[PDB]
């Protein structure tokens, strides 16, 4: 048994049963191993979710780091876009990443993000809050997208849905566009907000 | 038995057992009725979750509507703040609100949000995007902090760390200042960026 085999079987199990189904007991069963063999690789469900979150960042978070020469605006925009793709990559992906934490192996990346933003003129405090805001908006975006996909299949059709006109125009617009335009516009509002604040200082 | 009683006993059960423990089955036992009697009030768990979320808004979301004389910036700031209070009113509150669909009893409120923001100069598309972004940011801020509170107790305390200096100063600052200040700073950055966009147009 290898870390890569445990992580890929767990991400397959996540897509089969969702996050509440994913338990170390059911993963050991899936792998065909007794619970103590698995415990050596994964101590508990918190360690398994932290490892699945980092695997999804290693596969999809292409802008975890700023690129050399990139503007701070482009970095923060591209970072949220790739982090969104990591959360979308699996069933209940955003719930798997919620509350996770980097390992020491990622600290150099986070340091580099801060060094980059502060080189471009942010205070440490405002670099922290720009990173925090873009990731919290992105997590909220995908948590709601994923749960809407589940919920909309569970709810019975109302006989008649008598909806006032601006609301109907707005939900039809969102449906026609899908989630990405509203996501990108929100993200761009954050970046415009940080630029106001930075220019001011 | 009426729907108010079903909702109040389900909110009491949510605080006792959490969202995963909230079953139609334990709700019936708590109301003294057979499980099929609840069907008529709530057809399945998603209908129950929708009613619980909407009762939390009806109790706590004091800025669901714009208030007389408010600017659009005070309405969006105050809306995010009172939405956060509704999400924090119960155990696993934000998990219950994810993916909720309003009923027709909420449509006047939502139409009035869009009439107000378009009277205050937004296009209907950008009023949808601003409301979307405030609420997604708020859901991500509350869910991440509530998950961190639980996840930090499930990780073993390391004998080794080795944390680079900007990252150590940043996490120390965030912890000292608190997650509520971080939420208000991101909220403000969104509001400032909506203002930059409205001007440029």
């Amino acid at each position: 048994l290898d870390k890569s085999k445990v992580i890929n079987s767990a991400l397959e199990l996540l897509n089969e049963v969702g996050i509440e189904g994913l338990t170390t007991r059911k993963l050991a069963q899936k792998l065909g191993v007794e619970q103590p063999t698995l415990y050596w690789h994964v101590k508990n469900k918190r360690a398994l979710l932290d490892a699945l979150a980092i695997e999804m960042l290693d596969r999809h978070h292409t802008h975890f780091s700023p690129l050399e020469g990139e503007s701070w605006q482009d970095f923060l925009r591209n970072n949220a876009k790739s982090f969104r793709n990591a959360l979308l990559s699996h069933r209940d992906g955003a719930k798997v990443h919620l509350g996770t934490r980097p390992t020491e192996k990622q600290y150099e990346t986070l340091e580099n993000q801060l060094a980059f933003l502060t080189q471009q003129g942010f205070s440490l405090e405002n670099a922290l809050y720009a990173l925090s805001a873009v990731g919290h908006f992105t997590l909220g975006s995908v948590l709601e997208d994923q749960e809407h996909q589940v919920a909309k299949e569970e709810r019975e059709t109302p006989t008649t849905d008598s909806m006032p006109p601006l609301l109907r125009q707005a939900i039809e617009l969102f449906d026609h566009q899908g989630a990405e335009p509203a996501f990108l516009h929100g993200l761009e509002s954050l970046i415009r907000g940080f630029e106001v604040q930075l220019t001011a200082l | 038995l009426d729907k108010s009683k079903v909702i109040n006993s389900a909110l009491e059960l949510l605080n006792e057992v959490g969202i995963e423990g909230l079953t139609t089955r334990k709700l019936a036992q708590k109301l003294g009725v057979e499980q099929p009697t609840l069907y008529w009030h709530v057809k399945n768990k998603r209908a129950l979750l929708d009613a619980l979320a909407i009762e939390m808004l009806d109790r706590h979301h004091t800025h669901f509507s714009p208030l007389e004389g408010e600017s659009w910036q005070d309405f969006l700031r105050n809306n995010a703040k009172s939405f956060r209070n509704a999400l924090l009113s119960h155990r696993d509150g934000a998990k219950v609100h994810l993916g909720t669909r309003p009923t027709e009893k909420q449509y006047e409120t939502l139409e009035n949000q869009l009439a107000f923001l378009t009277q205050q100069g937004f296009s209907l598309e950008n009023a949808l995007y601003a409301l979307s972004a405030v609420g997604h940011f708020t859901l991500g801020s509350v869910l991440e902090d509530q998950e961190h509170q639980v996840a930090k107790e499930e990780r073993e305390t390391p004998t080794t760390d080795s944390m680079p200096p900007l990252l150590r100063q940043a996490i120390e600052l965030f912890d000292h200042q608190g997650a509520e200040p971080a939420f208000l700073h991101g909220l403000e950055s969104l509001i400032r960026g909506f203002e930059v966009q409205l001007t440029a147009l």
């Binding site: - | 902090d145 760390d161 120390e172």
Partner: peptide, 14 residues
């Protein structure tokens, strides 16, 4: 323990 207390402080993960 400083190390123990720091490991409990929130850190972003993106």
């Amino acid at each position: 323990s400083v190390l123990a207390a720091r490991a409990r402080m929130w850190m972003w993960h993106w």
